[PDB]
Design a protein around this nucleic acid. Structure first.
Ligand SMILES: [Mg+2]
Lengths: 50, 100, 209, 229, 71, 219
RNA sequence: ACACAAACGGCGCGCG
């Protein structure tokens, strides 16, 4: 089902993409995993502990 | 909101009680980001009763862990609502969907 | 009760005690750092060396008195930072994770100053410290006297402690990421772009790649 | 010395905010070389026109409420931060927006002046939700490059910040999107001559051609330093 | 700097530090200016450099102090 | 300031060897170091104009691994050996060179039949070792002027078109404090060249080439 | 007069 959705999307069924170094503009070797993930912040930020 | 959810997002927000709920089938007429007031359908309007329900949103207030709990509206004047509908979002919520 | 047991004076006070000129921070990895170096935040550094700063200020003569010196430090003025750099120019410092496993658990470092608030550690060393960056905190202490400074530099300094004492074997063996990249580099491909040429030496090899 | 000098051979306002541009002819590998540098320079170096001030009709802090409005004050700041404008021949200016009665608000409502430019009048501003409700706010604009946090700004200013003046972070960059492609196009009726295409998305505040030429000029400044040995 | 070499000259880790500190306080407040050149280092390093050369040593230090007492 | 950027007051010339001088720049606007380092790096290996040596016409040796007597190293190695040669040719776009030596001895670039309008970085460079007193070898070799570098992907032997007189470049980017902030970068560069053009002067040329391109977009 | 500043002992929850 995920593969079909990717095809319905705009990406290869593998989900991995090539990328380029923002410093040098040259391409990284072979595709890599690129994705969208849900990320949370924990109530332990540094300034409250240092 | 969370993109890849599990299906608990609506339920948790509602039972948490941090979000406001439509106690009666009604339509909305007011907004101040501090209060919300609802005009209720006749079938739930009581014979010696106003026919309207008003709510006061809790605003910036320190939590037990020193964090604000301010509620926010998610509706507009004249907008309909079923009884039990989500009236106002709270912290980490949107449209009554749990959003950490 | 005040004497006996875990709460007794022996454990409570004598064999372990709170110490001034100390601080705790959250850890981070600085790839740019050399093995002997460590990065620490300016905020902690400014506090930690106040007695040193006052001396340099009065050696500079800029501060009429201690209170004046303290008053200037409140400014956090540029000159303060200039003096702080001079003071910290080579002063060793002590970093320890908790609970310590062994004497390798505590080692000395030379500091560099950072704008943020985390304390930066060399990746190769942290492994010996068993540091995992999932949120580990770390404590810092400064040796004051001449004797301690030489003690810290002579023994505790990281360059000295490449060998484990439980076994005369390198504890410095590279990280997961560092080793893998080299592993990938050292592997061979049966056929590849540019394969089959003759090169005079690494110099052109780097250029060709 | 066989180099043919590239030129900004064509420009395209494919959209009122999105643009295309191409450079040609380019020597071997230079397209990648220039492409990377120009991308890097544009994102960092471009000079921006951005807003950082809010003066309001009586609230005293970011967390204050407001009568007869759909949203809280702080959310207003986020919308304003999103808002962008271009200013003609000026370094800073103050703008004001006044509305009354039940209605939603848009950038067009601002007290616009001919020497100021609003890139998207349709941009959304917070709404009014009472007949007697009214808003009358004032905002200041500045020219800058890069980004600045609000706290750092006031500490640099060090003059008294009166109550009722609210602080927001400056995000100057007129543009944030870069894609560039190198292709082979025919010059010298032969192969091994390169063609470069750039495309970007903007808040509309600058002309794309000015962007590349201004950026290239900036890069020349740093490059010239290497002759100073 | 990191020594890992001067210890060979004196032959002991502990003696290296002990002897070095003895010399260090001389240049710190005791006078007897550094023998090795100065590179905006600190006396701990400067004295450490002197032993790193093998230039300074305990036996020389013992000679240095006793001969100096004089009148 | 709105359209002004910090520039480096650069001081470092450390020629640990004349063939490579260590140079350093400071201060630079945040992030420019990677931009400048990458740009110059790409320029130096790819773009440099230079002369390259690529030809061998030799008796009986059809290909690089066909071999002949009188010399203690294979043709394959010799082709490698001569590639290390570096030479400056004045004016001419290509030049053809001849070598001829005999007897048990090592052979140097000095032995080359030369014009005098051509110069060697290391006349002492050795490209042969001879096995026996009767052993003697002679061949024709070519020098060609060209921009950049190519491998030998282009009856006679040929080798890479390595015009660029340089093969090393390492650049480093680390920060240094201004009186009130430490977000600015240093640039530290090391590179190595055969010495036809000593490293430092070539760097200014590298900047020159880039400047020529940007000048078209000047405002 | 050129000088001190706000912790004693428990409980719960979390942290590596
Ligand atoms: Mg951990």
């Amino acid at each position: 089902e995920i593969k079909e959705l990717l095809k319905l999307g705009d990406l290869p069924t593998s989900g991995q993409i090539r990328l380029y170094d923002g410093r040098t503009g040259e391409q990284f070797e072979r595709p890599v995993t690129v994705g969208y993930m849900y990320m949370l912040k924990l109530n332990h930020l540094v300034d409250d502990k240092m | 909101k969370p993109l890849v959810g599990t299906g608990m997002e609506r339920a948790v927000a509602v039972d948490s009680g941090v979000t406001a709920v439509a106690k009666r089938g009604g339509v909305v007429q007011y907004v101040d980001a501090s209060r919300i007031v609802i005009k209720v359908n006749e079938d739930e309007m009581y014979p010696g009763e106003a026919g309207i329900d008003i709510y006061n949103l809790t605003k910036y207030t320190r939590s037990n862990q020193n964090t604000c709990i301010n509620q926010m509206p998610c509706v507009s004047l004249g907008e309909p609502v079923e009884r039990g509908d989500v009236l106002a979002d709270g912290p980490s919520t949107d449209l009554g969907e749990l959003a950490l | 009760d005040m004497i006996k047991g875990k709460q007794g004076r022996f454990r409570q006070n004598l064999l372990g005690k709170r110490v001034d000129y100390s601080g705790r921070s959250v850890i981070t990895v600085g790839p740019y750092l050399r093995l002997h170096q460590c990065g620490l935040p300016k905020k902690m550094a400014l506090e930690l060396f106040k007695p040193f700063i006052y001396g340099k200020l009065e050696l500079r003569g800029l501060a009429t008195t201690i209170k004046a010196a303290k008053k200037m430090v409140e400014r956090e003025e540029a000159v303060v930072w200039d003096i702080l750099d001079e003071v910290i120019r080579e002063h060793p410092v002590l970093l320890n994770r908790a609970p310590t496993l062994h004497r390798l658990g505590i080692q000395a470092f030379e500091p560099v100053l950072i704008e943020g608030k985390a304390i930066q550690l060399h990746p190769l060393v942290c492994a010996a410290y068993n540091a995992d960056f999932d949120g580990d905190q770390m404590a810092v202490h400064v040796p004051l006297t001449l004797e301690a400074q030489l003690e810290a530099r002579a023994l505790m300094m990281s360059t000295n402690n490449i060998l484990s004492p439980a076994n005369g074997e390198p504890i410095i063996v590279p990280s997961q990421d560092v080793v893998l990249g080299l592993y990938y580099m050292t592997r061979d491909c049966v056929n590849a772009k540019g394969e089959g040429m003759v090169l005079t030496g690494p110099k052109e090899a780097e250029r060709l790649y | 010395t066989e180099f043919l000098k590239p030129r900004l051979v064509d420009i395209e306002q494919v959209s009122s905010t999105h643009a295309k541009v191409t450079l040609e002819p380019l020597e071997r590998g230079f397209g990648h070389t220039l492409g990377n540098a120009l991308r890097r320079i544009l994102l960092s170096s471009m000079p921006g026109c951005a807003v950082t001030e809010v003066e309001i009709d009586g609230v005293l802090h970011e967390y204050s409420t407001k009568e007869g409005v759909q949203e809280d004050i702080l959310e207003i700041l986020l919308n304003l931060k999103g808002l962008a404008v271009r200013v003609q021949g000026k370094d800073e200016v103050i703008l004001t927006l006044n509305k009354s009665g039940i209605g939603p608000v848009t950038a067009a409502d601002i007290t616009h002046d001919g020497d100021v430019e609003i890139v998207k009048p349709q941009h959304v501003i917070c709404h009014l939700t009472d007949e007697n409700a009214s808003i009358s706010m004032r905002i200041k604009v500045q020219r800058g490059r890069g980004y600045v946090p609000a706290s750092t700004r006031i500490h640099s200013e060090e003059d008294e910040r009166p109550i009722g003046r609210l602080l927001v972070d400056a995000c100057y960059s007129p543009v944030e999107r870069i894609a560039y492609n190198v292709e082979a196009a025919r010059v010298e009726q032969r192969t091994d001559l390169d063609k470069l295409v750039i495309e970007m998305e903007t808040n509309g505040t600058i002309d794309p051609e000015e962007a590349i030429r201004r950026a290239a000029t900036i890069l020349a400044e740093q490059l010239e330093a290497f002759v100073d040995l | 700097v990191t020594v890992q070499d001067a210890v060979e000259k004196i032959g002991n880790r502990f003696d290296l530090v002990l002897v070095a500190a003895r010399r260090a306080r001389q240049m710190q407040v005791g006078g007897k200016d550094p023998l090795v050149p100065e590179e905006n280092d600190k006396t701990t390093v400067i004295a450490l450099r002197e032993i790193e050369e093998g230039l300074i040593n305990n036996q020389i230090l013992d000679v240095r102090e006793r001969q100096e007492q004089q009148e």
